[PDB]
């Protein structure tokens, strides 16, 4: 009992709050209570961007957390919250976990330091592009792609996988983002 770890979290809605608590209780109902006793604290979302970093610092790091959780807000903004929390907790190399954010830039341990997520990103589904096209007697591609980082990463992944077949696509022409 004297050892007490302090896993924090950052969820979306207050109700999920309760869920989180009950979850961690199960993690103690089965595993032991001598050198452990995981203690769970959390916070809820804010819209003021820099307020995210300020709040996460002041609240979550004041309780010497060990690994923060992160999830998308109820209203979508593509990136929103993982960037501030990722940067702030990456100052001290405190590993965080993603829960929904499947966008491809994060999977680069040079601009995000420490970030482990639990859903494969968009780019990985490129593999399914291959396997399916491998089975339905097809060997030709005219793929389009955006110019954003997501498109670049997806096209590079597909080309790297496909060049193993000693083959290549026909055209890789890319349009500018937000075109009319």
């Amino acid at each position, epitope marked *: *009992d004297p050892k007490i770890v302090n896993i924090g979290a950052v969820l979306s809605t207050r109700k999920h709050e309760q869920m989180f608590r009950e979850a961690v209780n199960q993690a103690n109902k089965r595993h032991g209570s001598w050198k452990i006793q995981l203690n769970a604290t959390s916070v809820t979302h804010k819209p003021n961007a820099i307020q995210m970093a300020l709040s996460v610092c002041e609240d979550l790091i004041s309780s010497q957390v060990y690994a923060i959780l992160v999830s998308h807000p109820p209203t979508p903004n593509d990136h929103f919250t993982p960037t501030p929390v990722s940067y702030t907790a990456g100052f001290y190399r405190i590993p965080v976990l993603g829960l929904t954010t499947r966008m491809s830039i994060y999977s680069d341990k040079s601009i995000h330091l420490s970030f482990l997520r639990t859903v494969p990103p968009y780019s990985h589904q490129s593999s399914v592009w291959f396997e399916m096209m491998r089975v339905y007697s097809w060997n030709h591609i005219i793929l389009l792609v955006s110019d954003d980082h997501e498109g670049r990463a997806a096209q590079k992944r597909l080309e790297t996988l496909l060049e193993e077949r000693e083959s290549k696509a026909e055209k890789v022409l890319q349009f500018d983002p937000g075109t009319k």
Partner: antibody
Amino acid sequence: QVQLVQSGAEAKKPGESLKISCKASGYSFTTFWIGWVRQMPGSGLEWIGIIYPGDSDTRYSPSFQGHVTISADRSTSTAYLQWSSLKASDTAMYYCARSAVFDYWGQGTLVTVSS
Amino acid sequence: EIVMTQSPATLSVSPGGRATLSCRASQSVSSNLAWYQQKPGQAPRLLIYGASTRATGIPVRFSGSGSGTEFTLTISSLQSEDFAVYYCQQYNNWPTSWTFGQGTKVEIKR
């Protein structure tokens, strides 16, 4: 800083029903696997039951099922021990321990069943 | 449903010696052991769990070792206010098993 004071001694003839307490203190009650053990005169110790006081989940020994029903209550943390009836050959002493590696035992409350 | 074997029974050491209490399982329990001391007219206490670690507020004279079978506890420099009955117990399938032992009994020599 944990005390597990038990209840006073008890003696009664065969047939009736028993009720003893293990009221705890000093720690968040609904997080630890309270259990019970029994010691007859000069043989050693054996296990009888265990209960998590957060979901009232319970389990029992290979041969103790149905004789004694363990309980709980989250108002004063007192973990009772309901006795069915009779059990004349049950003169022993009953301890209530805490954390499945049992650490913080309580007092002794011998139960006497004679004629 | 795991029987337990503890020997010897009435070890007797001079009041500066040591002890080599043994507790052997019937199967291969990796590390799920605990040792208990019970002085007369009292309720036992915990001193070792995990077959190697020490509890809180326990002197350094105690230490244990072993795995699989033939668990050993060695009291170093047996002081005077020893002489309690000892016990060993294991917890592998928990919570289902909780099988104790029979334990030895030290007796100082004067």
